[PDB]
Design a protein around this nucleic acid. Structure first.
Ligand code: MG
Ligand code: MG
Ligand code: MG
Ligand code: MG
Ligand code: MG
Ligand code: MG
Ligand code: MG
Ligand code: MG
Ligand code: MG
Ligand code: MG
Ligand code: MG
Ligand code: MG
Ligand code: MG
Ligand code: MG
Ligand code: MG
Ligand code: MG
Ligand code: MG
Ligand code: MG
Ligand code: MG
Ligand code: MG
Ligand code: MG
Ligand code: MG
Ligand code: MG
Ligand code: MG
Ligand code: MG
Ligand code: MG
Ligand code: MG
Ligand code: MG
Ligand code: MG
Ligand code: MG
Lengths: 357, 100, 141
RNA sequence: CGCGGGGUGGAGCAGCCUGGUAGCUCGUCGGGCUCAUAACCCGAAGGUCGUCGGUUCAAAUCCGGCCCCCGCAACCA
RNA sequence: AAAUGUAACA
RNA sequence: CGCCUCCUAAAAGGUAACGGAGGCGCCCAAAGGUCCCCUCAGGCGGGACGGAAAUCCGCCGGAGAGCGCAAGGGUAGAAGG
């Protein structure tokens, strides 16, 4: 039963050679070993440091794949060197071997997921209906069920934050917290518009219809916009008010103006008579105005997302659920599972694992 | 205190609660010290006057329950952060009158 | 930082700083101690700054004992009100310290470490201080 | 800073003053009608009463302190 | 006295 | 804004400030008079419903309970039941 598990360590390791490109990185590795090889290469060591750190960046690829074809091959000869001599220690000592290379290959599979800043934060899934309407709101509810059963069959927590059910039948939108480990790595390769070509049940004479719904996926940040006001950067002017007051207002510097230096935000207050009532008030107004800019930043980045976020429309898609000839196709890598109502059960691993290249 | 506590090896501190012990003894019979083996103490274990091996003619004058030595966790900068961001509930005033 | 968890009274008259310490004048726990040479109200701020200075010098190891504690509420009226209209608001708390008191006390630490840490802690305090180590005079108390 | 009014299920309000008992409407959930949805009909679930402390035998309720909310006032130079 | 049913009829 | 209690008040009394804290504008026909009798809170153990705390049993106990309501003083050799 053991040589079936070498059969698989050679399977994930070959298309691991595909996106890593041993063929395109055994090449680049050589003229960095050539540039750094002539004695003048520590001439502007910025040039040098990037390449010696590159060199193991490519020798964790080239030479790690070089210990997978030699290593597995000295595993499969030692486990036949234990069957035909009845030597059971040559087969515990060629299995302690298969537990070591099952990690150098596990480590090399975290070039799929260890490359995305924060691919570990408890991410959120933002599903939306789309073209079509009732049909697509049905398909939207189908697709939340799909990712819920997915997340349960993967150790995530199925945590639903916000729903809104559609008025005919189904869901217009949903947001789930996929509270789990490394959750963003898996579900970010699920971002896209899921077309569902399908056969439709809401159309009277039973016509074949297309309806789309999207899945957008993001991680979790600090979401704290409470910047502290530090006196290193506030310049506070004091001067006289401009209206009524008497020998006062004239003869007293009651008005204050606080200007945040790096921003250029200015603020005044003249409302009361004490400069400290006014210095108080202008500190408030100055707090709130930098609370409104840091607001304007965040919304600005959000609108940058929204306007760069597809449209859930015709020809904007990634999948077929042609349930009238039983396929589900991911036009992007692209695979073709034929066991359709097994995908809705949560076999997304298929597409995901191959889509992380 | 003979021996180096194993808690000390783990980074702890030997707090010497008593550096001497109260005792009834003859003037002809005064010992110079009394040894105590603290090498077995972790963080945070403790020794008591009951654990004292006493020499002949000397007789413990405090309660055997009296603690003599303890090994305590060290001072650590990794904690400062939590202690700085630790918020304190403002002091409650004990009620008086129709407020008890 | 340090303050009473609860109290019978919120506010407290100022009193006065006459004489040497009532007690706590001898090293009672650690190996060395920082003794006050002149009287003052030591704020909880100052105590905490001294403590953090010492643990931040020890980095890891040692044991600090703080033997003063601010139970005396400090009061101040809101800025630019006039005299009268009641006693000010509680703004912080202080520990009453008089000449001769062992304020801080360190153990589990070499002599140069204790000397240096207690010195730096002394710079965080509003009074002149003096570094002492445990004596037979201390033990006899 | 002042005066006095509030905080009670998912939402909006009632309950306090003369303490023991938290109610109404919408919503939510299960069932019906319909080919289906809404509407309607039947049944159900749902509240640390802002916090700390505590008046009393007993607190949503009474009395202090803090915390957010709303209104008013902040004058004569 | 009582609302509505989109989007791919050979 | 009058009255009561405590502190500030510097060991007689008294003593101010828009000083620090709380109460009063009632109540009881017994919660009053006098005789007689009784002793608390709490802790530990035991014990059907039965709990931290109902009542019961035992042991430990000078008063930390109670004395209608604030506080103080007083108080079981009673002012308490
Ligand atoms: Mg003008
Ligand atoms: Mg002027
Ligand atoms: Mg002026
Ligand atoms: Mg099926
Ligand atoms: Mg004074
Ligand atoms: Mg004093
Ligand atoms: Mg000061
Ligand atoms: Mg003051
Ligand atoms: Mg003024
Ligand atoms: Mg005043
Ligand atoms: Mg003041
Ligand atoms: Mg202060
Ligand atoms: Mg002192
Ligand atoms: Mg100093
Ligand atoms: Mg003493
Ligand atoms: Mg006028
Ligand atoms: Mg007096
Ligand atoms: Mg007096
Ligand atoms: Mg007097
Ligand atoms: Mg006098
Ligand atoms: Mg007189
Ligand atoms: Mg009053
Ligand atoms: Mg009677
Ligand atoms: Mg009678
Ligand atoms: Mg009893
Ligand atoms: Mg019992
Ligand atoms: Mg029972
Ligand atoms: Mg019982
Ligand atoms: Mg009493
Ligand atoms: Mg009362």
């Amino acid at each position: 039963p053991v040589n079936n598990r070498i059969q698989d360590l050679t399977e994930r390791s070959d298309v691991l050679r595909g996106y890593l490109d041993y063929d395109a990185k055994k090449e680049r590795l050589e003229e960095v070993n050539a540039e750094l090889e002539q004695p003048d290469v520590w001439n502007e060591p910025e040039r040098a440091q990037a390449l010696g750190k590159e060199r193991s960046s490519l020798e964790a690829v080239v030479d790690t794949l070089d210990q997978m074809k030699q290593g597995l091959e000295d595993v499969s000869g030692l486990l036949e060197l234990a069957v035909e001599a009845d030597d059971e220690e040559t087969f515990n000592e060629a299995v302690a071997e298969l537990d070591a290379l099952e990690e150098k290959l596990a480590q090399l599979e975290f070039r799929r997921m260890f490359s995305g800043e924060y691919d570990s934060a408890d991410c959120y899934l933002d599903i939306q209906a789309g073209s079509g309407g009732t049909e697509a709101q049905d398909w939207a509810s189908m697709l939340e069920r799909m990712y819920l059963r997915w997340a349960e069959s993967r150790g995530f927590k199925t945590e639903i934050i916000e729903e809104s059910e559609g008025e005919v039948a189904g869901i217009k939108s949903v947001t789930i917290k996929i509270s789990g480990d490394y959750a963003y790595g898996w579900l970010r390769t699920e971002t896209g518009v899921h077309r569902l070509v399908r056969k439709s049940p809401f159309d009277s004479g039973g016509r074949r219809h297309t309806s789309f719904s999207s899945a957008f996926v993001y991680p979790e940040v600090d979401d704290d916009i409470d910047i502290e006001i530090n006196p290193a950067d506030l310049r506070i002017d004091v001067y006289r008010t401009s209206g009524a007051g008497g020998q006062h207002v004239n003869r007293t510097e009651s008005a204050v103006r606080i200007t945040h230096i790096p921003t250029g935000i200015v603020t005044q207050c003249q409302n009361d008579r004490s400069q400290h009532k006014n210095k108080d008030q202008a500190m408030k107004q100055m707090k709130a105005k930098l609370y409104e800019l840091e607001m304007q930043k965040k919304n600005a980045e959000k609108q940058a997302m929204e306007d760069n976020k597809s449209d859930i429309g015709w020809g904007s898609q990634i999948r077929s659920y042609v349930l009238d000839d039983s396929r589900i196709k991911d036009l992007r890598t692209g695979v073709e599972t034929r066991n359709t109502q097994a995908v809705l059960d949560g076999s997304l691993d298929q597409f995901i694992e191959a889509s992380l290249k | 205190f003979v021996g180096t506590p194993a808690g000390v090896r783990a980074g702890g501190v030997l707090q010497e609660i008593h550096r001497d012990i109260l005792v009834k003894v003859s003037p002809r019979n005064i010992p110079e010290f009394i040894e105590v083996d603290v090498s077995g103490l972790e963080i945070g274990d403790s020794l008591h006057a009951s654990d004292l091996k006493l020499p002949p003619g000397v007789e413990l004058a405090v309660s055997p329950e009296e603690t003599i030595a303890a090994v305590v966790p060290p001072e650590d900068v990794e904690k400062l952060a939590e202690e700085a961001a630790a918020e304190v509930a403002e002091p409650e005033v004990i009620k008086k009158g129709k407020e008890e | 930082m340090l303050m009473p968890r609860r109290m019978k009274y919120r506010k407290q008259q100022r009193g006065r700083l006459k004489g040497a310490t009532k007690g706590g004048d001898y090293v009672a726990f650690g190996d060395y101690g920082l003794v006050a040479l002149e009287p003052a109200w030591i704020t909880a701020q100052q105590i905490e700054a001294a403590r953090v200075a010492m643990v931040r010098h020890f980095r890891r190891g040692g044991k600090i004992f703080i033997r003063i504690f601010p139970d005396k509420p400090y009061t101040k009226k809101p800025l630019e009100v006039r005299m009268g209209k009641g006693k000010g608001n509680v703004e912080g708390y202080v520990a009453v310290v008089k000449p001769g008191r062992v304020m801080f006390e360190v153990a589990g630490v070499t002599e140069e470490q204790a000397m240096e840490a207690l010195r730096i802690a002394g710079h965080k305090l509003p009074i002149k201080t003096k570094i002492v180590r445990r004596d037979a005079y201390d033990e006899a108390q």
